[PDB]
Structures are given as structure tokens and as C-alpha cells.
């Protein structure tokens, strides 16, 4: 859908646009567990991005990407965000399994590393955050997939 490109110079720059970021998500409010698809090479920053937007909005704490346990439960001032890293989810069918299901079917905000390991059991995104890099500097394109990322989309402007 709508779309937004944003130059980030450098990691300090990453930490402010995840809390603002994440500062939209929680003043939308939704019934609806957001998707959060994260997606850039090893290294792009998608779990220092992550960081930003749970430390941002008053984690306090590491964020400690969660390669063998797939899933990172938070609870942020009584918000629920589950931080998913998939890439070692064998296949998708195993996601059925674990905890899962009340993760989706919740007012939660869900960020998703290697969604693409998960095809076909993880809900749809609402909004795509594609990153690219050069050095210490990224750029981030967020694309909308849903009604609500449009609504995420425009929440960013002033
Ligand atoms: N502008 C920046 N944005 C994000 N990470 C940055 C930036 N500049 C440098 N880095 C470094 O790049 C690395 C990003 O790693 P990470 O967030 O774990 O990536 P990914 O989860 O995509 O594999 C970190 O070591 C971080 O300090
Ligand atoms: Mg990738
Ligand atoms: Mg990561
Ligand atoms: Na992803």
C-alpha cells in the first residue's frame, strides 16, 4: 500500500526511529495482534531496530534475539510484544505447536524475523520493514499490507 522510505545515518538514528515506531503502534490501540514483518540480510539491523522499539517504549533490560526459543515474550507496561526470530524453525507446522496461538489472537504487537520460515501458519502482515545498508548507515522502506498499515503509514506524518 502506502509506502514510506527513511534514511537512517547511524545506530543512534535506528534506536529513535524504532521507538517512534513503536510509540505508533501503541497509540493505535488495537483489538488486533499487529504483524510486524522484519526483513533485511544478516547484519542490516532488524534485532538493534527491535531493540529500539521495546526499549524504546520503557523495557528495561537486554534484548536478547531468540535463536533456539523462536519467541521472546515482553510485557511493557501491560502491552504484550513478542519478539519472533524463525530462522530456525525447521518448518512452519512447528509454529501450530509451541505457545503461538494466543500470541496472534491477542491485543498484542508481534516483530518477526525470517517471517518467510513461518508461510502459511503466521498470520499476514500488516506492515513490511524492508532494510538495506552501506557501512554504519541503513535506509528502511515500510510498505503496508493491510488496512491498518496504511493507517501505521500515515501515522508518520507531521
Ligand atoms: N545504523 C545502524 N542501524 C542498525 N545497526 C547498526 C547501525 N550501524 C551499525 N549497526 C550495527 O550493525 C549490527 C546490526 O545487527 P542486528 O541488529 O543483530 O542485525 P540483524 O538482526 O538484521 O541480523 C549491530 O552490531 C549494530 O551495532
Ligand atoms: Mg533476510
Ligand atoms: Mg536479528
Ligand atoms: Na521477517
Redesign the pocket.
Known sequence: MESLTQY????????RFGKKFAEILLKLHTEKAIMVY?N?????????????MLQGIGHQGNVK?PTYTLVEEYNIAGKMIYHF?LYRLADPEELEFMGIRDYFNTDSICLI?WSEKGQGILPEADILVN?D?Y????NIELIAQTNLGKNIISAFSN
Open positions: 537512517i545515518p547511524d545506530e543512534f538514528s535506528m534506536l522484519l533485511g540480510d544478516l547484519g542490516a539491523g532488524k534485532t538493534t531496530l527491535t531493540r529500539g534475539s526470530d524475523e532494510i545498508y557501512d554504519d548507515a541503513r
